[PDB]
Ligand binder design. Structure first.
Ligand SMILES: N[C@H]1CC[C@H](Nc2cncc(-c3cccc(/C=C/C(=O)O)c3)n2)CC1
Length: 274
């Protein structure tokens, strides 16, 4: 019934993907996020295992649903005449990573390492469940501030993971790889790695490396902030122009810059004041 189940709070954020509100489950006072998505704006429609038409985003969220805290959990969903309403997990207190970096600037490498590791674990969880996120970026990462735990959100641009070529894309252009800009052709995992390179640069420098198509295509990385040689190496590897020159996930997590990660709780205690 929705109205009798949730008390709607203030708008957390909005866009083409939808409008996300703070909410509370009236049942047990659980903090939730209530995301509204217009039907007219859904491009990718999905198949439920029982044969009901839902947005692909619902398909993908159910597929990644788990006790694993690295990916946002879908709690319920509703269909309305003109929209879908998604009830999502909400950590409290929380801060979106984009806002975190906007406030604090370039992150210390120990913190970036902890954050980047957790994103890698979350993205590996998605792929292992057959889900390609397609919009990995700071804005789509929430920080559980008490626990030091990160959560991937916004599966509205995602697709089922396949090993064949993707010829469609509606994620964030400044995180999209050169093969998409030039050819309108990418493969899931190597494009994901590219976006991860953009993200890591963003963490350690406080902003993204490329603004224009010409820059993405050239792939020349300039460091505006002091960044260790190992981190620079990892970033430049992720941002290899040829998709096949990019590291696998295993290679990223075995990289020397990635050793001795802090646990999330240690991360909270040292860097999040907790
Ligand atoms: N692309 C979106 C735009 C709204 C942004 N705003 C915020 C800010 N603070 C918290 C949240 C939030 C809290 C709980 C769940 C979610 C999930 C959103 C989603 O899956 O789309 C999002 N969302 C998040 C990224």
């Amino acid at each position: 019934p929705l109205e009798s189940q949730y008390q709607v709070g203030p708008l957390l954020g909005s866009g083409g993907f939808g409008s996300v509100y703070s909410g509370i489950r009236v049942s047990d006072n659980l903090p939730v996020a209530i995301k509204h998505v217009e039907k007219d704006r859904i491009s990718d429609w999905g198949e439920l295992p029982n044969g009901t038409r839902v947005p692909m985003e619902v398909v993908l969220l159910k597929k990644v649903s788990s006790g694993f805290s690295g990916v946002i959990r879908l709690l319920d969903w509703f269909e309305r005449p003109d929209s879908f309403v998604l009830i999502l997990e909400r950590p409290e207190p929380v801060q979106d990573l984009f806002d975190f970096i906007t406030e604090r600037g370039a992150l210390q490498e120990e913190l970036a390492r902890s954050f980047f590791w957790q994103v890698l674990e979350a993205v590996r969880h998605c792929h292992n469940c057959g889900v390609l996120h397609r919009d990995i970026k700071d804005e789509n990462i929430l920080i559980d501030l008490n626990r030091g735990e990160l959560k991937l959100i916004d599966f509205g641009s995602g697709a089922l993971l396949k090993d064949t070529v993707y010829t469609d894309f509606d994620g964030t252009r400044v995180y999209s790889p050169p093969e998409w800009i030039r050819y309108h052709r990418y493969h899931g995992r190597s494009a994901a790695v590219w976006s991860l390179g953009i993200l890591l640069y963003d963490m350690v420098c406080g902003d993204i490396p490329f603004e224009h198509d010409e820059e993405i295509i050239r792939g020349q990385v300039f460091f505006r902030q002091r960044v260790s040689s190992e981190c620079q190496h990892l970033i430049r590897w992720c941002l290899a122009l040829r998709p096949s020159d990019r590291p696998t996930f295993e290679e990223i997590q075995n990289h020397p810059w990635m050793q001795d990660v802090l646990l999330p709780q240690e991360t909270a205690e040292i860097h999040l004041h907790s």
